[PDB]
């Protein structure tokens, strides 16, 4: 936290944040959502961290360097220590990236090492080579060298992600699954876990061993698991919540913007809301059925009339405002909704479904007031526009995630937020063997395009290929893009440090401070 001069801080330096759902885990190797990451950035610190404007900055590494984007050398600060006063060494990173890669860990993010293209990643994941073969090395206790198979200029960018955070050899080996229990956890971020009560709260407290302890202002932070955006908003209104989750209820939003307008933050967010189709199950394995659903959805109504929070209607997976994206708007998007509907009617007919002999399927959503509102609207539009019968089902956040991965669904509400600001953050998720591939989409052609991005002679060449890769997904109608998110949440007047200027929303509680009020 960098407290301005004019600022007169409060006595109690504590914060309460809504975290949207009960997290999958606190183990950095077992998580994949936004909620999990919120908490992780507070507890575990990797090589780099994001500053308040979302730019990669020194974390555990103080300085780093690369030899042609292929060999990267990280110089670890000598004062970095764990929760228990033990130092953070190069060896911690060696062990942690190995465990992430290890097929046994079954991390939903194992593929992250593939995205960075660390030497031998393929075979390890494949199980042909042991994780010990990873192209990572502790040169000495304070030197961590990374060897890649190709030149990746944006490599350092990936490093602020929790999956590449170090984990404690000791606790892990000693307690296994129970290592994250408060009595057993060892952390290296600004905070330590004080308390964890499932479906009630997670309470964090200042970690005095953090190398940057003198700049930490908030002594305690509480994370709540409230999935009802309305409840969040009520409780914030009561004055029990300082910063809500960044999902705003469609019901109250307009109200809010008029009564407490300085507390309503609405910033650009590098996320895409979409309806994911299980690509491997009949009849969704047919591109005509996929395309009809993509086309029959009326983005206009959903974005501008139903929701109405400032999101942008989407035509791609990768948000067009991502660093390095030069996208082409598809022709279907430039049409009239009735033109799209007619087209859509036709594709489905061709596929064998008409309003007389219709298609019926399940639309899965994670429990949420916002998501439920939308799914209803969407099911209505497809009924209206296509004569399809949609059956709504909802699951709990961690169950919802697991279903997606299992492929025991039809169509699901989905969202993907960038982990780094570069097109591959979105694109790598569609790789046939990607651990994050929950569309169950497999395109050799798509694979080859992405693969080619790391074999190019220059940067321009790179971006044309990313535009080509998006055209392919769209061709295949892998998904149904809906909108490009706005980051909209309520922040009490006394919370300092929340700029809203990081499109990744990678907030660190060590960066906020309470003002006298």
């Amino acid at each position: 936290a960098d407290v301005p001069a004019g600022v007169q801080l409060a006595d109690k330096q504590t914060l309460v944040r809504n975290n949207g759902s009960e997290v999958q885990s606190l183990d950095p190797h077992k998580i994949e959502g936004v909620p999990e990451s919120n908490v992780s950035r507070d507890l575990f610190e990797g090589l780099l961290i994001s500053d308040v404007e979302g730019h990669p900055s020194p974390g555990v590494a103080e300085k780093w360097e690369n030899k042609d984007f292929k060999v990267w050398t990280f110089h670890l600060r000598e004062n970095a220590k764990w929760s228990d006063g033990t130092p953070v060494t190069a060896h911690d990173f060696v062990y942690s990236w190995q465990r992430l890669a290890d097929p046994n860990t079954a991390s939903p993010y194992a593929s992250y090492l593939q995205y960075g293209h660390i030497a031998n990643i393929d075979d390890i994941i494949a199980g042909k080579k042991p994780a010990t073969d990873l192209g990572v090395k502790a040169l000495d206790d304070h030197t961590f060298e990374v060897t890649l198979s190709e030149p990746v200029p944006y490599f350092y960018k990936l490093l602020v992600h929790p999956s590449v955070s170090p984990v404690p050899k000791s606790a892990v080996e000693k307690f296994g699954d129970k290592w994250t229990q408060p009595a057993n956890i060892v952390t290296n971020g600004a905070y330590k876990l004080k308390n964890w009560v499932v479906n009630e709260r997670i309470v964090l407290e200042r970690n005095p061993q953090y190398w940057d302890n003198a700049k930490t202002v908030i002594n305690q932070v509480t994370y709540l698991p409230i999935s009802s955006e309305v409840t969040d908003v009520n409780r914030y209104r009561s004055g029990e919540i300082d910063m809500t989750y960044n999902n705003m209820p469609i019901e109250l939003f307009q109200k809010l913007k008029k009564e407490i307008p300085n507390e309503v933050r609405v910033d650009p967010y590098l996320c895409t809301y979409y309806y994911e189709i299980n690509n491997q199950k009949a009849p969704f394995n047919d591109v005509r059925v996929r395309t009809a659903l993509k086309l029959a959805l009326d983005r206009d109504i959903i974005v501008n009339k139903v929701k109405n929070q400032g999101d942008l209607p989407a035509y791609s997976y990768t948000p067009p405002y991502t660093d390095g994206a030069k996208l082409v708007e598809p022709e279907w998007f430039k049409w009239s909704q009735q033109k799209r509907n007619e087209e859509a009617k036709k594709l489905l007919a061709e596929a064998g479904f008409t309003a007389d002999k219709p298609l019926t399927f399940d639309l899965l959503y994670n429990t949420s007031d916002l998501h439920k509102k939308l799914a209803i609207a969407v099911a209505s539009i497809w009924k209206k526009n296509l004569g399809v019968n949609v059956n709504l089902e909802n699951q709990e956040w961690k169950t919802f995630l697991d279903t997606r991965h299992q492929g025991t669904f039809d169509v699901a509400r989905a969202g993907w937020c960038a982990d780094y600001n570069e097109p591959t953050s979105f694109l790598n998720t569609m790789l046939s063997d990607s651990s994050n591939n929950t569309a169950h989409y497999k395109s050799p052609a798509f694979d080859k395009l992405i693969a080619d991005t790391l074999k190019v002679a220059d940067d321009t060449q790179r971006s044309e290929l990313y535009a080509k890769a998006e055209q392919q997904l769209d061709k295949d109608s892998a998904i149904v893009p809906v909108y490009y998110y706005v980051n909209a949440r309520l922040v009490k007047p006394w919370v300092g440090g929340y700029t809203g200027k990081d499109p990744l929303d990678n907030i660190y509680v060590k960066n906020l401070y309470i003002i006298k009020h």
């Binding site: 949207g20 759902s21 994949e32 959502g33 936004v34 909620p35 999990e36 990451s37 999935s227 989750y245 999902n247 996320c271 994670n366 949420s368 956040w397 995630l401 989905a414 969202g415 993907w416 937020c417 982990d419 998110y485």
Partner: peptide
Amino acid sequence: VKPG
């Protein structure tokens, strides 16, 4: 990451 997946958003809630």
